[PDB]
Design a protein around this ligand. Structure first.
Ligand SMILES: [Zn+2]
Lengths: 117, 68
């Protein structure tokens, strides 16, 4: 499912349906349009785990766990510069909400069937 | 350069870290609660909160202060 998450993140980046941060995620869940969400686990968060699943797991939540924030940060691309090799100075990303309009692709049906269970 | 008149700085934003802890609270269960009210204006968002001073408050885009 790693390639499915990669292609849906590429779809969100190519259609500008990707948003970064936790305050905008809070606004999206309070405004009741949050459909997709990706969480973080095994990170440098001291007591933020109970907080992030308390403010996340309300209703219709897909559980996606990323092992490292810094690996998540280069995956989202907070500082995606110097593409001819290694990025210069990246900082890891927190929990984000994916409000992407690209519901028709080669694996969006597979993603929705996996999240149906 | 250093003139006769002393230099006065602007409103520097203090690093109030972990302000997200002031947004919500966690009970024993998964339910959520807030200590800030909700602005009912259309120019304000459904999730946009309102400030907390000793007597009154302050909105965001609305900038309405409800006083009794
Ligand atoms: Zn307001």
């Amino acid at each position: 499912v790693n390639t499915a998450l990669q292609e849906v993140l590429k779809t969100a980046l190519i259609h500008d349906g990707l948003a970064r941060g936790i305050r905008e995620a809070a606004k999206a869940l309070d405004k009741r349009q949050a459909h997709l969400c990706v969480l973080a686990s095994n990170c440098d968060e001291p007591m933020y785990v109970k907080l992030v699943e308390a403010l996340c797991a309300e209703h219709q939540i897909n559980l996606i766990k990323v092992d490292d924030n810094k690996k998540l940060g280069e995956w989202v691309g907070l500082c995606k510069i110097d593409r001819e090799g290694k990025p210069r100075k990246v900082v890891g990303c927190s929990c984000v909400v994916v409000k992407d309009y690209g519901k028709e692709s080669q694996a969006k049906d597979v993603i929705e069937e996996y999240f149906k269970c | 350069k250093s003139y006769t008149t002393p230099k006065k700085n602007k409103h520097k934003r203090k690093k109030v870290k972990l302000a997200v802890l002031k947004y919500y609270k966690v009970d024993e269960n998964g339910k959520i609660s807030r200590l800030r009210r909700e602005c009912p204006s259309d120019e304000c968002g459904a999730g946009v909160f309102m400030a907390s001073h000793f007597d009154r408050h302050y909105c965001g885009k609305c900038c309405l202060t409800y006083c009794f």
